[PDB]
């Protein structure tokens, strides 16, 4: 299936090619609903991302749900960073694992057609 | 007929910030004002990736009652009281101690 080794590969392949002005322009469908400026700083987020993924042992990378409080302490200590960044990175891998399972079960055109952008009420951003 | 108005320099009469001085940022219809550097609250925010706000404890200025602030007369160096008079055809504001126009 999908692992943080496969996310390691997706990430050292994506930190090579990627930019935030070539990625926020290839879509004008979610550059109208979300602010055109909310992309990221790609170099920093993918260098932190590759740092945090590299700090992992091979059994924590191949199986991402065995990572708990002590392991996040240690991933924060080896890459010299915050337990909160490690947290929200295990959370983005959680969502993209969710989405590659939803591309796996349903066809590429049914999981690209039923994808939804939302407003809590129809007024802009509110 | 608003005694305290935007941009005035006020002094805080009451509360933790009593004695302090500052410039009025805006007023709310509740009889409340928001003064600069005054009445600072530490507010926790849950990070919004839509608004590109991080989270955290961020210090913001809280609404304070307008009964609690006085127009500051820099002339007498004290808290003062406003009254309205008719100069030209225009209603204007003046101080009650030395009786001169704002």
């Amino acid at each position: 299936g999908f692992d943080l080794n496969d996310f390691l590969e997706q990430l050292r392949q994506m930190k090579n090619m990627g930019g935030x002005x070539x990625x926020x322009x290839x879509x004008x469908x979610x550059x109208x609903x979300x602010x055109x400026x909310x992309x990221x700083x790609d170099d920093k987020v993918l260098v932190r991302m590759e740092a945090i993924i590299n700090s992992m042992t091979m059994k924590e990378r191949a199986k991402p749900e065995i990572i708990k409080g002590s392991r996040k302490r240690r991933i924060a200590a080896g890459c010299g960073m915050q337990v909160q960044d490690v947290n929200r990175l295990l959370k983005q891998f959680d969502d993209m694992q969710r989405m590659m399972k939803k591309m796996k079960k349903g066809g590429x055109x049914x999981x690209x057609x039923x994808x939804x952008x939302x407003x809590x009420x129809x007024x802009x951003x509110x | 007929a608003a005694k305290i108005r935007r941009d005035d320099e006020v002094i805080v009469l009451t509360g933790k910030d009593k004695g302090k001085r500052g410039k009025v940022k805006n007023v709310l219809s509740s009889g409340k004002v928001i003064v600069e550097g005054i009445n600072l609250v530490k507010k926790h925010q849950k990070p919004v990736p839509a608004l590109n706000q991080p989270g955290g404890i961020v210090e913001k200025e809280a609404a304070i009652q307008v009964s609690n602030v006085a127009i500051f007369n820099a002339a007498t160096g004290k808290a003062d009281r406003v009254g309205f008079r008719f100069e030209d055809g225009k209603k204007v504001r003046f101080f009650k101690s030395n009786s001169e126009t704002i």
């Binding site: 990627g18 990625x23 290839x26 979610x30 909310x38 992309x39 969502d95 591309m103 952008x117 | 990736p49």
Partner: peptide, 18 residues
Amino acid sequence: MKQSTLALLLLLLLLTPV
């Protein structure tokens, strides 16, 4: 291609708004 662009788009992109 098809799964390269559907990966890459939804990845950089849905990394962004959530």
